[PDB]
Amino acid sequence: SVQTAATSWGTVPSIRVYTANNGKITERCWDGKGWYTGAFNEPGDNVSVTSWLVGSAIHIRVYASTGTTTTEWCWDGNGWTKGAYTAT
Amino acid sequence: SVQTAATSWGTVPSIRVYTANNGKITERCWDGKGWYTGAFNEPGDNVSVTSWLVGSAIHIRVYASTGTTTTEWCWDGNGWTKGAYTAT
Amino acid sequence: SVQTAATSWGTVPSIRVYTANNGKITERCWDGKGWYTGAFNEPGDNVSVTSWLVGSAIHIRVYASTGTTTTEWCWDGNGWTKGAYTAT
Ligand SMILES: OC[C@@]1(O)OC[C@@H](O)[C@@H](O)[C@@H]1O
Ligand SMILES: OC[C@@]1(O)OC[C@@H](O)[C@@H](O)[C@@H]1O
Ligand SMILES: OC[C@@]1(O)OC[C@@H](O)[C@@H](O)[C@@H]1O
Ligand SMILES: OC[C@@]1(O)OC[C@@H](O)[C@@H](O)[C@@H]1O
Ligand SMILES: OC[C@@]1(O)OC[C@@H](O)[C@@H](O)[C@@H]1O
Ligand SMILES: OC[C@@]1(O)OC[C@@H](O)[C@@H](O)[C@@H]1O
Numbered sequence: 001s002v003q004t005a006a007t008s009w010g011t012v013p014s015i016r017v018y019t020a021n022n023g024k025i026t027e028r029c030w031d032g033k034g035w036y037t038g039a040f041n042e043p044g045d046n047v048s049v050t051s052w053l054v055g056s057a058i059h060i061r062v063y064a065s066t067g068t069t070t071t072e073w074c075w076d077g078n079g080w081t082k083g084a085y086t087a088t
Numbered sequence: 089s090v091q092t093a094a095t096s097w098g099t100v101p102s103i104r105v106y107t108a109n110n111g112k113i114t115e116r117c118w119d120g121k122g123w124y125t126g127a128f129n130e131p132g133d134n135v136s137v138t139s140w141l142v143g144s145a146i147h148i149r150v151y152a153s154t155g156t157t158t159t160e161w162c163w164d165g166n167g168w169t170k171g172a173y174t175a176t
Numbered sequence: 177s178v179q180t181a182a183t184s185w186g187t188v189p190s191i192r193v194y195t196a197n198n199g200k201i202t203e204r205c206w207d208g209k210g211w212y213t214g215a216f217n218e219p220g221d222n223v224s225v226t227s228w229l230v231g232s233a234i235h236i237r238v239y240a241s242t243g244t245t246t247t248e249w250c251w252d253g254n255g256w257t258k259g260a261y262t263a264t
Contacts, residue, residue, distance in 0.1 A: 001133040004151045008138040017151055035173055045177040050184040063180045085211055089221040092239045096226040105239055123261055
């Protein structure tokens with residue numbers, strides 16, 4: 001089936017749910033006023049996520065896997081880019 | 089194999105582990121004095137979870153997926169019910 | 177594909193990413209100065225993780241599943257050992 005990963009922050013809260021569906025990962029977002037589709041859209045069959053809130057900044061790391069390749073995607077306030085993570 | 093998701097809160101801590109096994113999701117709970125089976129029991133092939141502790145209240149969101157359908161289940165102090173989450 | 181689980185703590189942050197790949201779970205670690213391979217290496221087809229930071233101590237629980245058997249692995253400052261978790 002589709003596979004999901006979820007994270008949340010604050011007291012509202014903000015929630016992000018990532019779904020790997022048919023080789024594509026998309027993102028659904030809740031910030032207290034309805035669910036909406038987020039900017040994250042990248043290939044993957046499996047997804048995990050962690051996040052940490054520091055001051056006014058949310059930092060999100062999404063680990064997207066296809067086959068034996070895992071790509072880390074980073075949100076640090078200014079869009080998603082690939083991070084330095086490697087599997088070995 | 090079976091697939092799990094885990095969350096924890098406080099300093100004891102309380103831990104919740106959700107297992108998707110043969111199309112059913114069940115819940116195991118630790119609050120510092122032994123593991124026990126929790127109230128959550130719903131269909132699903134895949135599970136993720138996030139939680140946030142505010143004051144004296146734990147809020148838990150469990151994302152249960154079967155095929156391409158994901159159902160959000162909500163704990164806000166008074167049993168589990170379906171939440172407003174949709175995949176699109 | 178390979179399946180991952182991730183957790184993080186503090187403001188650096190420290191990040192741990194567990195990958196179930198071909199029946200084996202390994203661990204990649206970030207503490208602010210490069211990714212490296214951690215001590216955790218145990219069998220499993222699926223992995224989840226949760227952690228909680230108390231004072232100067234990180235506590236990590238990794239749930240490793242093979243077939244219908246899930247083993248909890250515990251980090252409490254002194255290496256990884258099996259925990260009391262059972263699926264029922
Ligand atoms: O629109 C909300 C948003 O900016 O929040 C932070 C990240 O989750 C982004 O992908 C997302 O688009
Ligand atoms: O700022 C991005 C970055 O340094 O954040 C910490 C880790 O997620 C790294 O892999 C990543 O490149
Ligand atoms: O009994 C403990 C319990 O109430 O804790 C909160 C939720 O995890 C419930 O499913 C669970 O039954
Ligand atoms: O109180 C329940 C609720 O509003 O909590 C926030 C989100 O999880 C929503 O999907 C959900 O319906
Ligand atoms: O070397 C860093 C380390 O000790 O951090 C705590 C755990 O993640 C361990 O598996 C890991 O080896
Ligand atoms: O100190 C280890 C332990 O007691 O921690 C809490 C739970 O993870 C238990 O299953 C585990 O045996």
